[model samples]
Target chain A: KIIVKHVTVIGGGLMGAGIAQVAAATGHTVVLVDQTEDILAKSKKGIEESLRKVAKKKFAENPKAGDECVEKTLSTIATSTDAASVVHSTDLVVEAIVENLKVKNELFKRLDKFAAEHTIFASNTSSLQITSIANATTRQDRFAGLHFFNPVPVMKLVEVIKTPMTSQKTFESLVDFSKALGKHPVSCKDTPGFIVNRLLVPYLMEAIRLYERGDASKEDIDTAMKLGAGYPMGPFELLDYVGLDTTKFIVDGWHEMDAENPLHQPSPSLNKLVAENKFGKKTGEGFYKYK
Target chain B: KIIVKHVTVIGGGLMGAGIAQVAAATGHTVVLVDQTEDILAKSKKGIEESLRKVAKKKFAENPKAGDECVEKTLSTIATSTDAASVVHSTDLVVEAIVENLKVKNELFKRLDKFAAEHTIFASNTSSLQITSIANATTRQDRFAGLHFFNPVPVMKLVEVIKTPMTSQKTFESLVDFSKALGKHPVSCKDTPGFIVNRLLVPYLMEAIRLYERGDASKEDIDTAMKLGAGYPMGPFELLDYVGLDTTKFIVDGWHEMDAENPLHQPSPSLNKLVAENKFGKKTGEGFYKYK
Candidate 1:
């Protein structure tokens, strides 16, 4: 796997910015594409603020080197509204755009016509299938999934997913690229929820059902788990923090594929809360209320 | 709720001995009972070794104070072979006997007649129902559960379980006693597996299924979860460390309750190993071989 010199990241959201920031920090020229310049400006600002904090400690010994490091990383990232044009000269293209299948397909379809024949394409999707998303492009062999967790720069895990159509070279390149960016890579077949979501989502839903049955209050459930299980956070506390809508979306997607599997089945209370727009901590309402 | 002063722990196993050690260290009088004098001697030796470790650090500032602390805690605990004789004077009787239901009920039934009206009877069961265990005794209001983890002095979790018949005062007293022993307590109704095991058992099983399916190798799966999910340990590593027999026992108990639930259903691969007596770490093999 050759080192990817120029990288393209679509959607200047938090996920996109974090990917671009990490790429630029590791000496790759990054092109961050979004729908509008305003969103791109916000992403650029957020990345710069984060870089300052990192530079403060990382380069604490020499102030001049710290300034140069920040400036150099920022200079490597180039933002644009048109991915179709920007992807023309990139070694790898990572899409972290909207979760909607249609929108992602349309974007990848257009970029497929303009991107270099050797340019590798990947998606930072957590729940959606990489094969379905790759269907829009003719380069199924080059297309793959590069699922990064939230707060991408902080998280060390990256699931490098491959469908049956994804070539061996493509999968290995994604693995090698992840290592180059200082993230641990795990190769996974394009299954329902990759690895983490497949196990973690169901576990969290079971916790909600345990509370719904009136066996224990949410507070006791959380406290018992933290002390009893050696978990960093309780189920309810995490459900609230991760956002109910996101949790619902992941389970519901799997439930659609196999409704008979109880693990994929959505809990009534979780769905009701999502319907009420009590999408957890972000909305200040979920299983618990935040003042 | 009145603070429990005189405590009785029936069983001279590690769990019972550790509970007695903590209770004694906290200035409560403890009676440690077993079926035989040899078992009682072993329990006393184990507690003494553990207390020395605790006292060494706890009273490191003054060497004489450390010796006194160990002796004082040791002096507070008395050993006996008769639960009936011990329960007559204890404010709380904690049963940590065999997992078999009949032996526990017989012990509790005999002690119920000898114990004072104010004596609270509790079980340290991880899988059994508190209601069924308390059925032999007439003190349902004072009967509850104080589910302490193994090596009780090291682990701080104590799940305080109450059936519908358990009084509010009894539950609070259990909670207070847990706190007094420096263990964090969480209250729950007498449900299967309480908080931690209820959420954890199925998860560990699912990880086993994922491996059995050949979706990913054990090494990659472990790396993915630890790095991706921010988990301290991966599922497979934990399964081996926890011992397959313990894992199977929890699921088998749950499967007996609800065989229809896939999560509760035992794994064929797991059952085969248990039948073969390859019960992980102790026997040197389960999912992975140990040296």
Candidate 2:
């Protein structure tokens, strides 16, 4: 594949670690970049444990390969604290950092000077504008969005998004690169929530609206969708599972962009809950109490 | 147990037959009413086949009971064109007829006077208003909405919609009635789409809009929703399975009520297809071809 040989993932969080593990497992040389040695150590250990679980299942027929695969993939990934040093040598850089636009832009602006002209930059943002983030770099044509779902190795869909400024060649390479990692690549414009969240969050938000309207209780809303619509999870359960803050951020952001859309209107209860630190299952409370 | 002892179902269509079969199977004496002897015959045949399918599994431990159950349930149902005669003796009435408000109101108006005062009336409309339909009767306090999904026996949800005028006693009986049929019941106000379709239809509509705007392909949107969001079916496939005309009617109705909801805005492509009679799977053409 003419898609990059050396790749740098700019965060050692859950998403970045999974991305690095998969990219290395699929034969791409990977650099797992984070701030501190302690964080990098933890990230590497997480990937190692995941690989052990995966290799045991995937290479069961060959115990030799099962042992060799983990080491071989780990050997390909190099950890770093300074992204500038890694960006200068890498062929591609993927940012799975914090969701804040300003923080992301600051990181990208620093990398813009150091990353080689040939290196393509991508953000694994579930929400936020690719163009706004791309504006920090002179290489707008090379900057694109490579949004991946949670548990990156397990979830097979990768949205290869391009802004109006993204070159055809850059978009094609990202598409090819996603395929190389054994992901089902779908092309999308750098629009709000891309595809899944665009369709999903609105349904969830409306389900909340229905609850607020007293048309149905939250429990009934969830039950109705699960049994009535053949959904895997009810809207409230999903909202609680997928973090209320994350959902609120997406809707709040979209509402900012277009105030007229009722679907984007922020729920008062959601905002109050977020303010109270009830993020969801993680915080032990959201639409429902976990404990 | 406090719900009703006898039921009368008007329409003799898929929804009506399923409702009647389930009601009968639950030990209620049911009268299946329709306009013609031929139509009623076909409806009863449909119900018989469905009951045979169900009874075999439900009474798998005893084949004799299963066979006997089918006969017993079938014996409970008496087909008739004289709804007035059946309504006079029945404790409850369910309407699952044509979408035409005039036709539905005409039947309810005719039944309103002739039916016993104790009979609780309900309409299984996916789209009409319980309030509007209740306008045809002096029994608004007893008239309510009991919307069921297609293939009603299998899909175990019944939206028990109550108009402002529907008495609490009437609503409670409907709830108990739905539960007695071995289906989960949810309370919804006599609002648009109730719970399931209100949240669902808009999501399906926006997915089409995303396709029209060149955000992504139909195939990708479907794949994204299924894999990314863990939905049972993609919006496009669901739109096709649901029939484009039916979806169009729902959205169009909402659009007429509230022109501002972006979710309710009728799709031009959807409109053109409806005009051309590519109604979906039933018509062998929609967002996709069935065969």
Candidate 3:
């Protein structure tokens, strides 16, 4: 049985904070690492605010328990600016840095040199090669991908991706770790986007292509998927929810990897949106305008 | 304004019966026509049972009111052995016959001779050509496709399909008709699968192809889609829900239309299942065996 005590979460961005919050709430002492104190403070505040919302929604019936849950999570999490120090003592380290592959590889290389020998290195990357990240570490068998969905507390699934070098014991331990946190663990190979994105990204791109061809308006296409089919979010709506720039980057990256896959072919409309820097909800414009 | 008072539904199978039930339940007088009295009776019984289930589920708080809802629907539906006689006095005719192009064309030819000029002609076809069906009639402007989902009382969206020959007035009337029955209508050209199937069919087929290549087990694929991606049903489960033979036939039809599209390529696994006569829920064996 693998016992997780101290967990270090690198990069205190939205994804990083959510990961840290969930880890802390599930009984792991967490160190949230970022480049600057201000970034770490903001990420800490975001996690607290999110926890408060969850408390309100879930525990309106039991105020004391809700308050206790929130307080316990807050007390378990600690923010830090010293990445090397954070890596040295932690049992597991998860990097949620910028999507740039070079930045991730560099961070992993640093952690490999500084962190404890038994520490397992993992990434929260949504669409990158897990093998490439694993290669940056000397203990390849201990490195893997642990992908958590958005609004981590509510979304129950945690994809435990296995690279060829990953040890079976490491995979099983992570699976057990996920179950302990009350998350459903599903194993997938280190394929592009694994299972979800491989199926979903292509479908979203096709919806964009249909929109560009004047086959249907954005609203209608979204509505068709939501009402005609039973998808929780339509393609365009989901595209906006997951920033336009991020979507474009993923598509372009896949296209670069495999140009012949028609599904991965980039849409001109997506390119145009990215060129304008109307990067969806982050900005104020995308398939749908946000206020 | 197009008024739908007397509605004619052809075929009297599951699709036809469900369509008739919803139309009748919404206070329209419906004529459900089949080739034989035995089929007509079976269709009527199925509709009655479905409506009863809906009433029980919705009005469990008031059992008498639930019984009344089912009784009202039963009272409004009329059955017929001769489709031509059923169409003679109807205001709107919905053809939910088999997916055979020749048979549908022949049905429309007969409908054209008997139904009044002002009466609307519609097909509940999921994958046949609306244009070819309309070709049998002189008044193409009065014809459209009113594609309804299975178990009609539950699924809310109705596709109002418009062929190149379909007039704006007919499309609007069908939209109005759908809204009258409490359905949110989406308008689309009579392209293959309209909106849902155009994207969904190819995606499902791709999943099947992936399974055929030994990339993953059927259970893993199903679990990945449901747990990983949050789909209500996996591709194989859906194929089983919607017969394997039917899926194969639809893909074959699409290939016939445009053989160049790689997405329309047939799966040998699907062919094998069909050959074995394991056609899903109906046969109890498909991608996964159903107990």
Candidate 4:
């Protein structure tokens, strides 16, 4: 059984900060590790800000409880630029570093050398081979995938992916760990996009195809989905929210790996948008231009 | 300019009654026409019961307003079995009869003879050609498809379908009529399943395909969609909610119309279920065995 008292999250980006904040808020001592002191400081501030926002929303009924909750989160979260030192004390080390396989493998390789034998290793890569990542570590049985959605604290779902090499004990511990943080953990086999994106990305891609085919106008298509089909955000709006470049990259990656899957084949229009660097809300253009 | 006031909703089934309630609630004098007095009485009672449910939810906010709203709805709604007599006084006639092309066309042909010159003719057929129904009327400009979803009072979307012969003025009038009833109307070309089902049905079929391929267990696939995809119901659950026979019929109808559309190809697994008379929730057996 993995005694998950301290969770060390590597990478100080949005996902990392959100994960650190969630873990910390649930009473576990959390260490947010990054490459530089500046990045570490930025992550700390980001986590604190997120915690305050969540505290306001969740504890609005009782101000004193909210303040206490904020204090508890602040006390739990600590930051470090040194991974090796952080690994010495952590019961679990979750890496949300760059999606590049080589960089991710290298990180795990170093963590395998530095971390304690009982410490669990996990990756938060949305679409990558988990077994390959686990192979970089000495204790493959302790390695798994702890996939969390964006704005991790708000999204209740956590896909606990188990590779063939991952032990049943490690998977169960992660599920328990996620539940402790108020997440609904679903177990899935190590597959592309796990469960959500595997099904959702294809549906989104089909929506793009419908647009390219001129089946409906952009506004009409979105309205049809929102009113007619009951989606919170239409496919195009969601694509814009999730960068067009990122969408293309994911589809292209899947297509290269499994050429037979028609769903993975990227639309020419999507490619053109990505080529123009019109990458959704961040770049202010995609399927529909944003204000 | 078309001025719709006395609306006649043909057929006193669930769909027809619901449509009548919506029109009546929106201050239109509605005559719900059916084949017999029993059905007309049953439909009127059903509408009143639905209004009472609405009252319970809204009365606490403003009791007098809610009570008056229900009373106004009941006052506006009247029932009759004589379709010809009802059409004589109706400004607009929306048909929600059984999904039989010949029966619908014959009914419209009869209405064309008896109805006033300005009274618009519309069909609520889910699958049949709107143009074919319009062909029954001598005035093609006055005929169109006014597709409303099930439980019409609750579902706000109304697809105002326009065939090649449907006049822009008539379409505009239909749009106005929909707006008058407080429904969100979207214009769509006269295509099979129009917009919502064109996209939604194929997606549901693909989910069935996934189940047939044994990519995942049926339970897991359904759960994945409900939890991961944020759909109120899974494709399989929806297939059950929407009868297996009904789903098969729609797909088969589309396939018969357009063989080139690979997406509309019916699944053998689905056909077998329908063949076994496992319709869905109504028959108590489908993708799931219901109590």
Maximum-lDDT candidate: 2
- Candidate 3 per-residue C-alpha lDDT over B160-265 given as tens digits, one digit per residue, 9 for 90 to 100: 9888888888888888899999998987777777777777788888788766765556766777778766788887888899889988998999998888878888
Q: What is the lDDT ranking, best to worst?
A: 2, 1, 3, 4
Identify the runs in model 4 with alpha carbons over 4 angstroms from their true place. Answer: A56-72, A81-85, A135-140, A288-291, B56-72, B78-85, B135-138, B206-230, B234-239, B255-262, B265-280, B283-291
TM-score of each: 0.96, 0.93, 0.94, 0.87
What CAPRI class is candidate 4?
A: acceptable
- List runs of model 2 lying over 4 Å from the truth: A52-71, B52-69
Q: Write the per-residue lDDT of candidate 2 for residues B15-63, one digit (tens) a residue.
A: 8999998899899999999989999999999999888888788998898
Cα DockQ of the candidate 2 complex: 0.82
Model 4 over residues A250-290: C-alpha lDDT tens digits? 88889999887667777999999888899999988887887
Better of 2 and 3 by TM-score: 3
The CA-based lDDT of model 3 is what? 0.85
Whole-model lDDT, model 2: 0.90
Question: Tens digit of lDDT per residue, candidate 4, span B163-231?
Answer: 899889889999999999899898777878877777788888877876676555567666666766677
Whole-model alpha-carbon lDDT for candidate 1:
0.88
When sorted by TM-score, best at the front, the candidate numbers are: 1, 3, 2, 4
lDDT of 3 by residue, A101-165 (tens): 89999888888988987788889897689999889778899899998877677778888888999
DockQ of 1: 0.74
Best candidate according to TM-score: 1
Pairs clashing in candidate 3?
Answer: none
Candidate 2 — number of clashing residue pairs? 0
Write the residue-wise lDDT of candidate 2 on A205-248 in tens digits. 88888888788899888889989999988999999998999999
